[PDB]
């Protein structure tokens, strides 16, 4: 048998990328645009850590296109992603989306643009 | 067998949603992951495999051996 009822109580990793996929579906347009810029500069170079961006140049960009006023508001509107574990950050000051290149460009083509 | 997997999925035309599932071009590996995540699922309460380090589940251990 396939253990119908027993499959119900137990749970595996499918039972994150898709977790954030619904979060971004419910946000503000400024958050949408800033994450759009993040995902471009992190998908340009599976979305690997080498492909991310530095927060120095990231602030340079989100201030050039006139989105971020300074670093405090930037990190604030970033932690809303962080406070649900919606993007990765390591160190350069790399903010790298651990979500796959496929799923990332899917976000672009479907929910972002 | 992907050939048999398409033999068997479209073998049910009577359902609408299952038919629309049956034309997905990457359905082979998808259903592979489905069957795998049902099998490794039902093979933990049976004791054979152990989900070593829950919250990680990147590797596992085969408890039983034939012997």
């Amino acid at each position: 048998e396939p253990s119908t009822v027993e499959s119900t109580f137990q749970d595996v990793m499918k039972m994150g990328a898709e977790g954030a996929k619904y979060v971004l579906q419910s946000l503000t347009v400024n958050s949408k645009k800033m994450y759009k810029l993040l995902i471009e500069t992190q998908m340009q170079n599976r979305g690997t850590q080498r492909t991310g961006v530095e927060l120095k140049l990231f602030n340079h960009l989100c201030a050039a296109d006139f989105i971020a006023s300074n670093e405090i508001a930037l990190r604030s509107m970033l932690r809303e992603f962080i406070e649900h574990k919606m993007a990765n950050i390591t160190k350069m000051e790399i903010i790298w989306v651990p979500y796959t290149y496929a799923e990332l460009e899917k976000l672009l083509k479907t929910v972002l643009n | 067998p992907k050939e048999e997997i398409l033999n068997f999925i479209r073998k049910d035309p009577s359902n609408t949603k299952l038919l629309e599932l049956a034309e997905t071009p990457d359905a082979f590996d998808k259903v592979a992951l489905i069957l795998f995540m049902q099998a490794i699922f039902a093979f933990e309460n049976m004791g054979l495999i152990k989900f070593q380090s829950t919250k990680s589940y990147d590797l596992v251990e085969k408890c039983v051996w034939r012997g």
Partner: peptide
């Protein structure tokens, strides 16, 4: 030590999976 990680997997929605 490039291991096949379940991240690189074709995910299936709960509906398709269930059905």
């Amino acid at each position: 030590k490039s291991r096949h990680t379940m991240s690189m997997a074709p995910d299936v929605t709960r509906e398709e999976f269930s059905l």
